[PDB]
């Protein structure tokens, strides 16, 4: 099932990073994912194509100019037709996580508004934006990398495109050679015992989540098997 994502950005060429390369580049080429960009600069009318403006109240920064940005959004909305969710990427938004990604991926159409400078007029958020989303508690130079991050994450859910599946960190992975700077591959992985290997990997995920991100465990209802392997991992750690 196709996903269409409209993008509003002063730097649309940044999105070549996801539309021209890798898994996401394939998804675009195969028409599984469509990414369409509108640049507020194209909606300006003055000679110098001005896209920023001064904040009321003063301050050292600038904001996105309202008229070109508003017009770009309206154009994207018209192209989307009915049912597109309009998202503003900002640190004031809902924190993105895999559960949030799964939710966003349920939309067939999204419009992603990328801010630059000190951001956008609050009244545009009120009148034009459906949801604000943050990719993390850090400050960037613009909304483009967050938008690309969001697109990449939701793209993985599109059929044909391709251990947080159960909320745990991933297990360690090994490939050739069998010995690397004196470090050997765990023999269980060489055993060909599919069930032993499954349980080892799950136990490692549980142990790594417990040691690195114990808060993630509290959010889970562990299966009987997971409870057992976690107990074993914690016992081995204390021995």
Ligand X SMILES: c1cc(-c2cnc[nH]2)ccn1
Residue 143 binding ligand X, by CB under 6 A: yes
Does 139 sit near ligand X (CB under 6 A)? yes
The yes or no reply on residue 151 touching ligand X (CB under 6 A) is no
- Residues β-bridged to residue 6: 36, 111
Residue 134 sits in the site that holds ligand X (CB under 6 A): yes
- Whether the CB-CB separation of 15 and 37 falls below 8 Å is answered with yes
User: Of 40-48, 79-87, 162-170, 228-236, which segment contacts a second copy by CB under 8 A?
Assistant: 162-170
Give 49's DSSP letter: -
The Cβ of residue 61 has, within 10 Å, a number of other Cβ atoms equal to 11
Contact segment (CB under 6 A) with ligand X among 2-10, 17-25, 84-92, 207-215 equals 84-92
What is the nearest approach in angstroms of a second copy to the Cβ of residue 75? 17
Peptide bond into 113 cis (omega under 30): no
The 8-class DSSP code of residue 181 comes to T
Q: For a second copy, which stretch binds (CB under 8 A), given 9-17, 34-42, 80-88, 223-231? A: 9-17
Rounded (to 5) percent helix, strand, coil in the chain? 45, 20, 40
Indicate which of a second copy, ligand X, none lies near residue 126 (CB less than 5 to 8 Å, by partner kind).
a second copy
d(CA 147, CA 141): 13
Q: Which residues ranging from 93 to 122 are in contact with a second copy (CB under 8 A)?
A: 95-98, 100-101, 116, 118-122
3, 73, 135, 233: residue in contact with ligand X (rule CB under 6 A): 135
Judge contact between 42 and 146, C-beta under 8 A: no
Q: Does 153 bind a second copy (CB under 8 A)?
A: yes
Q: Does 163 bind ligand X (CB under 6 A)?
A: no
User: Rounded distance, CA 227 to CA 61, Å?
Assistant: 52
Q: Which is nearer to a second copy, 140 or 224 (CB)?
A: 140
């Amino acid at each position: 099932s196709h996903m269409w994502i409209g993008v509003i950005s002063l730097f649309p060429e940044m999105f070549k990073a996801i539309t021209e390369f890798g898994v996401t580049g394939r998804a675009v080429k195969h028409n599984l994912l469509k990414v369409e960009c509108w640049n507020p600069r194209d909606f300006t009318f003055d000679k110098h194509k001005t896209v920023d403006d001064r904040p009321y109240g003063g301050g050292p920064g600038m904001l996105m100019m309202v008229q070109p940005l508003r017009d770009a959004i309206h154009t994207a909305k018209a192209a989307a037709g009915e049912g597109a969710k309009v998202i503003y990427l900002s640190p004031q938004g809902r924190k993105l996580d895999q559960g949030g990604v799964t939710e966003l991926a349920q939309n067939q159409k999204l419009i992603l508004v990328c801010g630059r400078y000190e951001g956008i007029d609050e009244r545009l958020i009120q009148t034009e934006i459906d949801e604000e989303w943050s990719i993390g508690d850090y400050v960037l130079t613009g909304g483009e990398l967050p938008a690309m991050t969001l697109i990449d994450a939701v793209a993985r859910f599109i059929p044909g495109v391709l251990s947080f599946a159960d909320g745990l960190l991933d297990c360690p992975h090994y490939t050739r050679p069998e010995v690397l700077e004196g470090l050997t591959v765990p023999p269980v992985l060489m055993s060909g015992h599919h069930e032993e290997i499954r349980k080892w990997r799950l136990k490692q995920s549980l142990q790594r989540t417990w040691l690195r991100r114990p808060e993630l465990l509290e959010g889970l209802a562990l299966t009987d098997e997971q409870r057992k392997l976690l107990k074993e991992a914690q016992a081995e750690h204390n021995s």
